[PDB]
Each structure stands twice: as C-alpha cells, then as structure tokens.
Nucleic acid binder design. Structure first.
Ligand code: NI
Length: 165
DNA sequence: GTAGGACGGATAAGGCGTTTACGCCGCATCCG
C-alpha cells in the first residue's frame, strides 16, 4: 500500500513519471501518434504548459506548469491515460497512478529537464540524446535552449522509474 | 513529502437514444 500525498499548489510546476505495466512493451513508441493525439485532446480541454517531455517505448517522464489558480494535474493525467487506453483499445496497460514531484526552484528544474532529455541514454536506447526523436528535445533545440549536440551526466536520484530487476 | 493492482467513493468519457442537441449513465483512473 502507498503513502504519498499529492503536492497541490496552484500555478505549480511538477515532474512526472508514467510507466506502462509491461516492461517489454513498445506501445508508447509504436503508437506514438495516438499518444501525441491524446495529450493534444486533453491539453485543449484543460490547458497546461509542457515544459518538457520524453516518451520511451514503455514509460515517459515529463514536466508541466499549470495555469494560474489551477492545481489539478490529477484530472489531466486521468484523461490522458484514458484517451490513449481508449484509442488503442487495450485494457489495463498503465502502471496505476504516477510519480509526482513539485519543482520549487530553477536548479531543480534544470536537473529535471536534463534528466528528461538524458533519459533515452540512461535507458540504453541511444548513445546520444539527439538520436532520440521521441521528445521535446528537438522542439527545445529549435529555440535556443539546447545545443543539438548536448550531452550530460546520467544521474540516479529517485524519479519514479520502474524497479530494475 | 513520496509507487510499484489498498479499494470505496469520486469525476464525468462517449455511445446510446431521440428531441439528430442534449440528457442518461457513469468509462477508466484519480485520491487518501
Ligand atoms: Ni526513465
């Protein structure tokens, strides 16, 4: 049984980790499109800012900032996993709920954005963060945020990742 | 501050039915 309490703060920024139940799945990748589509549908109905996001074949990590006066990432995640569950007609694919962490300062924010873009490399998919197309890294390189050839240390602070067994 | 199917009580999908424009019921997934 879990014990965490959602940290709700209006206008807040947070980091999240949502895992597919099945380790060998590649569904988030294969059906990249339905996923993309789902987040779009929900974003429209309950506005938020995607600070950053990666999708891996079987889980994703991301950072959101919610509108002023709005603390409700819960609904937003509930709808997202719902649309995508609907769209691909598969049942019980998600690890229930999700990992949430409130970002209170700029340093922490950057560690978590980096963590996001480094992730494909930590997970062994690619040797270079720009090799992975399934993220906002390229969106961010396309403003003057990150050099396309960016690299960074692979770190291990606890972050909602599935247990490595 | 903190997971890994707590599980009862919530929200409120979209497919049904007609009033082909909304109401009814109450998904799949949330929280404490
Ligand atoms: Ni990861």
């Amino acid at each position: 049984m879990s014990e965490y309490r959602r940290y709700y703060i209006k206008g807040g920024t947070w980091f999240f980790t949502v895992n597919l139940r099945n380790r060998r799945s590649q569904l988030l990748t294969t059906q990249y499109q339905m996923l993309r589509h789902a987040i779009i549908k929900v974003k429209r109905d309950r506005p938020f800012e995607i600070n950053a996001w990666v999708v891996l074949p079987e889980h994703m990590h991301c950072i959101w900032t919610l509108p002023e006066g709005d603390d409700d990432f819960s609904s937003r995640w509930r709808e997202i996993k719902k649309q995508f569950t609907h769209a691909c007609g598969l049942k019980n694919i998600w690890q229930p709920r999700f990992w949430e962490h409130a970002i209170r300062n700029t340093k922490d924010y950057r560690h978590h954005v980096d963590y996001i873009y480094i992730n494909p490399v930590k997970h062994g998919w690619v040797k270079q963060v720009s090799d992975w197309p399934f993220s906002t890294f390229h969106r961010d390189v396309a403003r003057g945020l990150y050099p396309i050839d960016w690299a960074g240390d692979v770190t291990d602070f606890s972050a909602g990742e599935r247990i490595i067994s």
